[PDB]
Each structure stands twice: as C-alpha cells, then as structure tokens.
Short mmCIF file of C-alpha atoms and ligand atoms in Angstrom, two decimals:
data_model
loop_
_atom_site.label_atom_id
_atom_site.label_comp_id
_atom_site.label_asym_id
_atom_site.label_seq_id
_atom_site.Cartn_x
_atom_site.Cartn_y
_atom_site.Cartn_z
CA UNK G 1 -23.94 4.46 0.69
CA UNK G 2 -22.00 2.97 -2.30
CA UNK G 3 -20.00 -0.51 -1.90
CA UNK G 4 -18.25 -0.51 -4.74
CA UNK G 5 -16.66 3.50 -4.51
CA UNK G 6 -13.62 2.12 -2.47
CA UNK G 7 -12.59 0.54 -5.76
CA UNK G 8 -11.99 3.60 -7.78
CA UNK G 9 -11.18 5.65 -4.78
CA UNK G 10 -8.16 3.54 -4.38
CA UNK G 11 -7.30 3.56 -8.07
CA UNK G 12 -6.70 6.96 -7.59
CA UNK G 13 -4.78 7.30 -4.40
CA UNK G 14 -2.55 4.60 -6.13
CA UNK G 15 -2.14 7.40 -8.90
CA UNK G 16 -1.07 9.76 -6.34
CA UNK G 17 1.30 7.17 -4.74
CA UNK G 18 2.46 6.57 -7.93
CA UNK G 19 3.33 10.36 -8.80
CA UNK G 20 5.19 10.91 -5.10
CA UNK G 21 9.02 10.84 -5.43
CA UNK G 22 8.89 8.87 -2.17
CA UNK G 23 7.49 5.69 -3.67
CA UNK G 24 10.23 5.53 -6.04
CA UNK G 25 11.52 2.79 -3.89
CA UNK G 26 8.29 0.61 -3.58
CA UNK G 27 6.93 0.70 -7.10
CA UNK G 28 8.31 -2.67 -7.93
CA UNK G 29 9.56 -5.88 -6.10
CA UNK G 30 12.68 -5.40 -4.19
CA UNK G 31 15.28 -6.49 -6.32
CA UNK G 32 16.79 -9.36 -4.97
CA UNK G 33 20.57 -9.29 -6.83
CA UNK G 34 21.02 -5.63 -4.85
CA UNK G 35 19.75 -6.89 -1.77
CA UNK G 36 20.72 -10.38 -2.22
CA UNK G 37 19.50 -11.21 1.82
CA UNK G 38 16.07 -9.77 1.10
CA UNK G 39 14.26 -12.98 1.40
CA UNK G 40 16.27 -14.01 4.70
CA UNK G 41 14.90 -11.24 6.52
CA UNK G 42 11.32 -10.54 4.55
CA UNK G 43 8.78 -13.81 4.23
CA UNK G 44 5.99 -11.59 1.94
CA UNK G 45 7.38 -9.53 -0.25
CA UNK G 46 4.48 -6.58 -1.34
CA UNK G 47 5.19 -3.39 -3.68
CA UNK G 48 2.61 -0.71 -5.27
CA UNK G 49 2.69 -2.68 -8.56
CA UNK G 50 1.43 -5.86 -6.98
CA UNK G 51 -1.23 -3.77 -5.06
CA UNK G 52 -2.43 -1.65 -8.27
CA UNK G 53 -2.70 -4.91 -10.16
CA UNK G 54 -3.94 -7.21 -7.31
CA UNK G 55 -7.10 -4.57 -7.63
CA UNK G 56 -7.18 -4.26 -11.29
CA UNK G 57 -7.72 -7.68 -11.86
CA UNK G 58 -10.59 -7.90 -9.57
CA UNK G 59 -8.82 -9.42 -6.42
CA UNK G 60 -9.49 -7.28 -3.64
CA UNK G 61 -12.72 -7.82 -2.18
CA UNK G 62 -12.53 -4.54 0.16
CA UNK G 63 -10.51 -1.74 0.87
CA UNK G 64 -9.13 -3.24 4.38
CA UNK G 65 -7.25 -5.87 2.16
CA UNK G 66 -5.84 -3.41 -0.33
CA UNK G 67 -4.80 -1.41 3.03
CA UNK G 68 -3.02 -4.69 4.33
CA UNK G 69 -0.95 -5.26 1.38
CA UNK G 70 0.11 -1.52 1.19
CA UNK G 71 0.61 -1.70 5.27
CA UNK G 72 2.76 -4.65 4.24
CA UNK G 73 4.96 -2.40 1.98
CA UNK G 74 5.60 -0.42 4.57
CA UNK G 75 6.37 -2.96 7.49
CA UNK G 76 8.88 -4.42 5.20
CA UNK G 77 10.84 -1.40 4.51
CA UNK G 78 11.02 -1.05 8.53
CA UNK G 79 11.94 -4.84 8.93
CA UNK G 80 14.25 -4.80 5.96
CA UNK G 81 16.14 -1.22 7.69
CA UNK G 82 19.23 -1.31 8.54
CA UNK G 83 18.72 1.98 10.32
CA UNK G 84 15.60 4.47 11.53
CA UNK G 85 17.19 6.85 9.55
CA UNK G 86 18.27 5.00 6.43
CA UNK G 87 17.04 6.81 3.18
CA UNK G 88 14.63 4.45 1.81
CA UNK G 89 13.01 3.89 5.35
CA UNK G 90 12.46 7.63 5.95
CA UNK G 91 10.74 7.83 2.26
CA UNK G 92 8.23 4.97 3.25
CA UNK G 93 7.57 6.85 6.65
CA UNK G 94 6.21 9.75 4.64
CA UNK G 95 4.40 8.19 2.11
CA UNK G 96 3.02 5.55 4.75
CA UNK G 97 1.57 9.15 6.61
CA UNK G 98 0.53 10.18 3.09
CA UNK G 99 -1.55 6.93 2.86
CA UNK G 100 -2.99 6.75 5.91
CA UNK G 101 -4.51 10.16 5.55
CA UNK G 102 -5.88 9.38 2.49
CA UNK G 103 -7.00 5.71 3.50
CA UNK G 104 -9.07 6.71 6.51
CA UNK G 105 -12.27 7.96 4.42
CA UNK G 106 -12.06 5.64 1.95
CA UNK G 107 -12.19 2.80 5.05
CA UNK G 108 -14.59 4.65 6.78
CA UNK G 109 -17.18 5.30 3.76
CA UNK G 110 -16.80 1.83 2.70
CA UNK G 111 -17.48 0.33 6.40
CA UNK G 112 -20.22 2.77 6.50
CA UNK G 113 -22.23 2.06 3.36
CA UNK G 114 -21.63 -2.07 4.07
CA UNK G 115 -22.93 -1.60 7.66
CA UNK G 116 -25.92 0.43 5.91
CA UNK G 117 -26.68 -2.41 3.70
CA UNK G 118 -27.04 -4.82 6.49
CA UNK G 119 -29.31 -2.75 8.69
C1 LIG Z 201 16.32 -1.45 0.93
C2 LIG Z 201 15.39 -2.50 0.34
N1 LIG Z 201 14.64 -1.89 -0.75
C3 LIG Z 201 14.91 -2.03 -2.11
C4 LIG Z 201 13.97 -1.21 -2.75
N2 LIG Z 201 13.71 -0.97 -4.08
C5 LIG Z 201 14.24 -1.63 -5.21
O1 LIG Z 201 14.96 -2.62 -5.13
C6 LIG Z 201 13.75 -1.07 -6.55
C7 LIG Z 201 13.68 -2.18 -7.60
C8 LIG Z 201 13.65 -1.41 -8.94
C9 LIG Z 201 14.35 -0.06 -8.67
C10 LIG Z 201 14.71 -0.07 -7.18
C11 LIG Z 201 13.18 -0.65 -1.69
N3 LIG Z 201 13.61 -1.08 -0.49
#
C-alpha cells in the first residue's frame, strides 16, 4: 500500500549493485580520454553514481524512472560493444539480470499501492 517504499527499496538494491564486482565498470561516467569516441556513438551517457544521486537528491518521482536510467546503463554498454562477448558487455548482462530480478517487486508494489490510492 505504501508510495513512498520504492524509494528506500531502491537505495538498497543500489547498495547491492554497488557491492557486485560486475558494476565495477558502470559506477562512474565512462571516461571519455580511454574511450575517446564515447560520445560519437552514445547521445546519454547514464552510470550508477548518477542514478544513486539522481534519487538522493529527491529527483526521481517513481521507480519506472530510476529503472529507465539504470536500463540506460545497460543499453549503452550494448551500443558502446565492440563485441557480444567483450568483457565489460558480458559484466552488464549479468548485473542487468541481477537488476531486473530485483526491480520487478519493487515496480510491481509501487504500481500496486498507486493504483490502490486511486480506486
Ligand atoms: C567500454 C566503455 N566503458 C567504459 C567503462 N568504464 C569506465 O570508463 C570507468 C571510469 C572509471 C573507471 C573505469 C564502462 N564501459
């Protein structure tokens, strides 16, 4: 029933992200003077610190937006690829399964209670 509980929720599978080897690669902006193309090939750049802090400071009205940005993150990587089996593309293909398991009851709760307090 509670509106607000994605908030938190998401703080903590952020934590989680956070503590996975696999997000090693996404914790930060890309750096653009080792992949000096970056911007050629990716118009939105999106990374976990952005997302953590994006929802810190109050700027994510729902959990479907925080789940666009981190979607983002991983839509990049697969753009950005030079290969399906590069290393840092095969880390974001776990931790994007990792998140998406995790995501689903947090979207579903929240859709849930907001559909409750319209009835
Ligand atoms: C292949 C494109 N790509 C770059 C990163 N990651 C990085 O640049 C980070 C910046 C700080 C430490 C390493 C992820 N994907």
């Amino acid at each position: 029933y509670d509106i607000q509980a994605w908030k938190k929720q998401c703080e903590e599978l952020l934590n989680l992200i956070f503590q996975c080897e696999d997000s090693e690669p996404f914790r930060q902006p890309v750096d653009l003077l080792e992949y000096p193309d970056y911007r050629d090939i990716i118009d939105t750049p999106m990374d976990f610190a952005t997302v953590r802090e994006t929802l810190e400071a109050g700027n994510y009205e729902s959990p479907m937006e925080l789940c666009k940005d981190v979607r983002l993150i991983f839509s990049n990587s697969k753009a950005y690829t030079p290969s399906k089996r590069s290393r840092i593309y095969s880390m974001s293909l776990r931790l994007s399964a990792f998140f998406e398991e995790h995501i689903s009851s947090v979207l579903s709760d929240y859709k849930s209670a907001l559909r409750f307090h319209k009835r």
